[PDB]
A paper describes a structure:
C-C chemokine receptor 5 (CCR5), a G-protein-coupled seven-transmembrane protein, is one of the main entry co-receptors for HIV and blocking it can prevent infection. Two X-ray crystallographic studies are presented of the antibody RoAb13, which binds to the peptide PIYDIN, which is part of the N-terminal domain of CCR5. We have demonstrated that the monoclonal antibody RoAb13 binds both native CCR5 and a free peptide corresponding to a short sequence of the CCR5 N-terminal domain, and that binding to the receptor blocks HIV replication.
Competitive ELISA testing RoAb13 binding against a synthetic peptide corresponding to the entire N-terminal domain of human CCR5 (hCCR51–31; see Section 2 for the full sequence), as well as against a panel of truncated peptides spanning smaller regions within this domain, showed that the core linear epitope (the minimal sequence required for recognition) spanned the sequence between Pro8 and Asn13, i.e. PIYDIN. It must be noted, however, that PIYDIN (residues 8–13) is only the core epitope for RoAb13 and not generally.
Author numbering:
A (entry chain H): 1 to 132, 139 to 224
B (entry chain A): 290 to 295
C (entry chain L): 1 to 153, 160 to 220
Amino acid sequence: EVQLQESGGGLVKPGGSLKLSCAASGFTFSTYAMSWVRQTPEKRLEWVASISTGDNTYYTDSVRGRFTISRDNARNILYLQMSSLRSEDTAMYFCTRGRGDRGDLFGYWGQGTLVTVSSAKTTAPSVYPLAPGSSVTLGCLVKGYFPEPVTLTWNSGSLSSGVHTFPAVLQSDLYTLSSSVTVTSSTWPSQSITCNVAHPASSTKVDKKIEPRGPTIK
Amino acid sequence: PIYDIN
Amino acid sequence: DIVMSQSPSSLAVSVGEKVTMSCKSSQSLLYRGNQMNYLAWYQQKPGQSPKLLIYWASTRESGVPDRFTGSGSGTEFTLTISSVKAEDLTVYYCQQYYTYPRTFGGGTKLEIKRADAAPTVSIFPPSSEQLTSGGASVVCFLNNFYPKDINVKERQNGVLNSWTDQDSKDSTYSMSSTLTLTKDEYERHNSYTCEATHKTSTSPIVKSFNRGEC
């Protein structure tokens, strides 16, 4: 009933600029004092900025001058404008709402938007379907996409268990990412199973239907 | 010859 | 610039036991004027935001189970887990909100240790489409096993790998395998095999095939 939704993350080259947007619904917005927290690639959490019930801003030293935190009570939105991004600032960005009508305690949390800062180029992904008596398995491969992240779903998300999606692996600016899914042999190819993949900010959206390889040489 | 899906 | 310290680094527990967390601080988060400890605990299930577990070093946030209790004061705080479940397989963090900057600790990963399981494998040739662009990569899939301590394998000039963090449901791990290659070099050989070597697998577990083009 308290929802925080980040927006507008992605990739910038160094020294660039990004304005994040956290959209809040489900409470008296002006009554609480909010903040932002980032999580390093090494999974370390760092506080960033905080903005009081009365716009007193508070920043961690590493971002002073570059980052400006700003709230608009009218539309229930919070912003973190990030100028002159250093290679350190590559991290996942959460907004937080105050615990109560009080200080900046990280009571509630957004889902997190990711900011990647290399100089590298936005590249859409390729999708390669892993097609191969008890139970069969099939997979989906995403060789070469940047920046992170992507969203892999099975049959438009209708496939719940049996999925073991794996963390991406950057080698030479191109993330490689697999996923496994298992059903009884009685299921595939009896019922169509498709890899669904989205890569943001490349604005691509791909679905590669898992089909049996078929015996054709010449 | 798609040697046997599985 | 108060420095938080959480110890130890790793861990190993089993469902039902007790768990003790240790947050060391570089200053007193206790203020004489209100006798309040400005400290909070967090639980971050992998792939999600953290949740606020404990605050004022003791008070349970609403909806927090009873099997979580916060104690300690001043500079050395403690998180209490009465009965560890598997819905608590994650990491844990402590923070202070005395002064700025707000600070977190190094965290503590509890790797549950339940039972040695049997790693299911599944080997996959390159797709009839990847070869058509340039390149090829076999994949084999380890699924639903414990422990995380199992390496797998004969020319190995460039592969990639990927592990899942532990499943919050069945306490398992799982492994990927990016056996990347050149397209034409994939025809220079015929017999293609992965193989695992577990803690319960003295005699390894194998999955194999021959190049479908011969």
